[PDB]
Amino acid sequence: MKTPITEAIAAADTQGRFLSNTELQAVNGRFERAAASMEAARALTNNAQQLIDGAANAVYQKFPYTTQMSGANYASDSRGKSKCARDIGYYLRMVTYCLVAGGTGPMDEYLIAGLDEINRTFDLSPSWYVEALKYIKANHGLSGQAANEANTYIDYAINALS
Amino acid sequence: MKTPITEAIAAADTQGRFLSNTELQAVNGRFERAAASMEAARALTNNAQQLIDGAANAVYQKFPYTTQMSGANYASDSRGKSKCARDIGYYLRMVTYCLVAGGTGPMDEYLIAGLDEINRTFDLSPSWYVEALKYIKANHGLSGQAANEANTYIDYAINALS
Amino acid sequence: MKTPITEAIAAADTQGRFLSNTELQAVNGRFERAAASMEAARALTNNAQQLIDGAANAVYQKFPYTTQMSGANYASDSRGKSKCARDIGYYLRMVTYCLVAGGTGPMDEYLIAGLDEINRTFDLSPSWYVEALKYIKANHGLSGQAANEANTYIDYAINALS
Amino acid sequence: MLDAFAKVVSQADAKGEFLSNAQFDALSNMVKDGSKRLDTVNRITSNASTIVANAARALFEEQPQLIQPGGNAYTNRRMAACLRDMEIILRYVTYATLAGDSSVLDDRCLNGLRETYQALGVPGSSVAAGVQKMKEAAIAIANDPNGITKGDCSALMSEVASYFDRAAAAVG
Amino acid sequence: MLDAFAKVVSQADAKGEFLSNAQFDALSNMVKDGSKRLDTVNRITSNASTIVANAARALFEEQPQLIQPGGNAYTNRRMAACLRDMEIILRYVTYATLAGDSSVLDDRCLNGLRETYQALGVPGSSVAAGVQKMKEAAIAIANDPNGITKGDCSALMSEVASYFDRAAAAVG
Amino acid sequence: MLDAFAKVVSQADAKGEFLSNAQFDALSNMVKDGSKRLDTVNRITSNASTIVANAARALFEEQPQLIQPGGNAYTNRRMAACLRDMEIILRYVTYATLAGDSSVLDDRCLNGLRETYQALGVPGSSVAAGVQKMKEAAIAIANDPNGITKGDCSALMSEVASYFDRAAAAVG
Numbered sequence A, B, C: 001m002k003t004p005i006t007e008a009i010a011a012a013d014t015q016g017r018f019l020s021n022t023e024l025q026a027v028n029g030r031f032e033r034a035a036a037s038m039e040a041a042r043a044l045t046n047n048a049q050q051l052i053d054g055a056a057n058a059v060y061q062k063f064p065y066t067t068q069m070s071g072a073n074y075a076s077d078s079r080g081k082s083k084c085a086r087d088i089g090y091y092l093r094m095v096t097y098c099l100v101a102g103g104t105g106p107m108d109e110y111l112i113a114g115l116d117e118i119n120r121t122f123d124l125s126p127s128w129y130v131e132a133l134k135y136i137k138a139n140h141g142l143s144g145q146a147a148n149e150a151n152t153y154i155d156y157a158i159n160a161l162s
Numbered sequence D, E, F: 001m002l003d004a005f006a007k008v009v010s011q012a013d014a015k016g017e018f019l020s021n022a023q024f025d026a027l028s029n030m031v032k033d034g035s036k037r038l039d040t041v042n043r044i045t046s047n048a049s050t051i052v053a054n055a056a057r058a059l060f061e062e063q064p065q066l067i068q069p070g071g072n073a074y075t076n077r078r079m080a081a082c083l084r085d086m087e088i089i090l091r092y093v094t095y096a097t098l099a100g101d102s103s104v105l106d107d108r109c110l111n112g113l114r115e116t117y118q119a120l121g122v123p124g125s126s127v128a129a130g131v132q133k134m135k136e137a138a139i140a141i142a143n144d145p146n147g148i149t150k151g152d153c154s155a156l157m158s159e160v161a162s163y164f165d166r167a168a169a170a171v172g
Ligand SMILES: *[C@H](C)[C@H]1/C(=C/c2[nH]c(/C=C3N=C(/C=C4\NC(=O)C(CC)=C4C)C(C)=C\3CCC(=O)O)c(CCC(=O)O)c2C)NC(=O)[C@@H]1C
Pocket: A059, A060, A066, A067, A072, A073, A074, A075, A076, A079, A080, A081, A083, A084, A085, A087, A090, A091, A110, A111, A118, A122, A124, A128, A129, A132, D057, D060, D067, D073, D074, D075, D076, D079
């Protein structure tokens, strides 16, 4: 994936040169930031379940028709609610991963590429996931730079869906 | 090979997409026309031998030198007159083919690609074949739109040779 | 390799055509001078040892530091002396080759491609080889046109080195 | 690529022959049902999303391991690819259907594909199962009595099925 | 690509050597026939249209099946490709002839050709029959005594033969 | 390509899992030696010219056939290319060093190198000897206690050795 290290390497390798000091500087920037990144990733991981369930519910409350309307795309039955819970986990797992790589690479490769195509084809509204993300953000219970890291990736997802 | 169908398909495939109503219309145009196309093809096929014979004599009248002059490229001897009749039959077969296919594709693939280089290398006057083609046009006996279908393809050969 | 003949061929091959008068004219221009060209090469070849030894000294005289400073790139010792003579003989061989062949291709291919990168990497001074070349120029003792030939190639080395 | 007309022309030209009476009739036969064939393409065509989604959706119920984390349809990039392959095969079947000849479906789609799906890890068994579902759905839609001049299209619907089977076999 | 000069240069360089007395003789000796060499290329070249035409005409007579419908030189495309190929081989023959070395023949024309004809279905032996007819016409024109200071060109004509045969051998 | 972080992420995502305790530990440990890792890269990089040139000069002393006429490093184009190969390999060793994973060294430099060498007549074994000499030099420079906070880099020097050994092994 695009991680800050593989991007330094790709940039030196494109120009066929040894790593710049510019690049070494950058990778150390990622070493500094790494501490606020692992803090968030560990916490999101340990509260995964309550966060997924929490965000599901918030979406069912915001968009009540998703539990009431007929359709393979909706969460009116047990099959759809469980597709939805899974999809929300996915988003959370991807944020985890961004924090650990120190970039959007994982989310970009595993989820975002093809995202607009999938949502049109299976007729899922981006706005459901926006809401799940806003819930995760408002309820991770982190502060300082750990918060900043997590919210930057989550907002990234949210920009992806807008 | 270029038929109106293979064109609509290549059109659609180049934009990596399903056939349009534009294309399905086009193809219906070939279907509507087919009646007048097949008709002429039948008659040309039936009268092939008299048309060919007639065509070669049209050519010898217009170009008497072609029966008198020495050289492997003229029809002064049995061998040349047979090359000439063979060739004339090829042109007519190609008209046939065109009618059947719904466009020039067969004449284009089998006869026109390479035509200019053949006629130069072997010192065959394009004029000669134009006369033969004019005789066919004047002597096929078709009328209405069958005539028209035949004439379009004959005139298509004539233009290639001018 | 660029000889005037392979260049003639390449030109004509690149335009997909037979060789022209322009090109046969040329090649004759080469075939006539092959005369001088070949005797120059014989003269340089017969006196190669005395020209290499003489030239290496010329260089050691104009740049005495090169026999005194230590370091791999100098001729302070026996190894370095031997590299330097070797290199000078490479230059003389190449002029031999160019003469035989009717142009620079041998020299261009076997010596000039990469030359600058080698002199930087191994920290050899182009100046030194210019002196050796000028000594060969001045002490082949050819006159007139057998000289004119030999000298254009020496001067082509000097220009490569500038 | 060849349509039915061009195929007859191409073999006639290899023998030096004008078209025989039979050949003229055989060909005359195709233009007859041509209106039928146009309904089939148009109908398959204007329901192609449906047919692609509902065959994939059903594929993934029968083969859960495809959409499991690690499975070959997991990630939206692979999932869009998988949907894409399905749209494509549908596409080339509709082309073959307009042509009356599987030439285009063999040249531009099928020749090479099995080798590609192996080099890639694409489970080829499942694409085949995929195409089976498309085929039923598209024939059913094509061959639906409602909203059309009624008549018999079973030559076509058998022609269409052979193209599907043929995709299934090329990867299966 | 090597002319005869460059070829000797190239094989001395791999040996680290100034040219031996021999080598200087060989090359000077070749340069004798310089002017004749140029006559040979000039004559062959400036008859190339005829040489190609007569040889192909003569070939299609001896091997009718080539121009029968379904045969390989039938259709004007194929006939033009077939004439092109013979023009091309004759072209490389003149090239190698100017050069005193078959490298350019082998590198740019011949290396990989048999495999292309076998891929396409081009009767390679037919091609060689063609090349052989080109050969005799070419040399006859080359060695012809009219219009030129007389002398011995028998060496050249065997060299030119060798290049033609070399090309026949690469396909036949 | 992967770095050490992305490698963990990708095998987590194939299995569907959030990262584990064990896994966060490991990845947190790569951030411990980050500063040292940067020194290694910087020190090898800041001495690339020297390492390459000295290694190559040593290679040609042990194996003089490379530097005789006809030899593979003879003529300036080949010596340049030889030096360039030494540099590329080093370059790729420094990338894998910064990444914490051999993936880029294998994928973009080593995959199919041996095959290219065999086809070209580059003595693979001679390159592996060159690589061997760049290893000793690069590690000496990287692990020299002057001009740096004293500390243990034995793990990192072991890794860096491993990247060279891979390169030697893939050509030699
Ligand atoms: C939740 C907020 C709402 C909801 C969810 C829902 N989703 C699906 C089906 C799919 N969701 C995905 C998502 C992904 N696939 C991936 O691989 C990734 C990245 C790793 C993502 C984000 C996809 C591709 C599908 C379709 C394929 C599949 O079944 O997995 C459904 C079922 C849709 C159907 O037509 O079968 C549902 C219900 N729906 C709601 O109403 C909730 C509010």
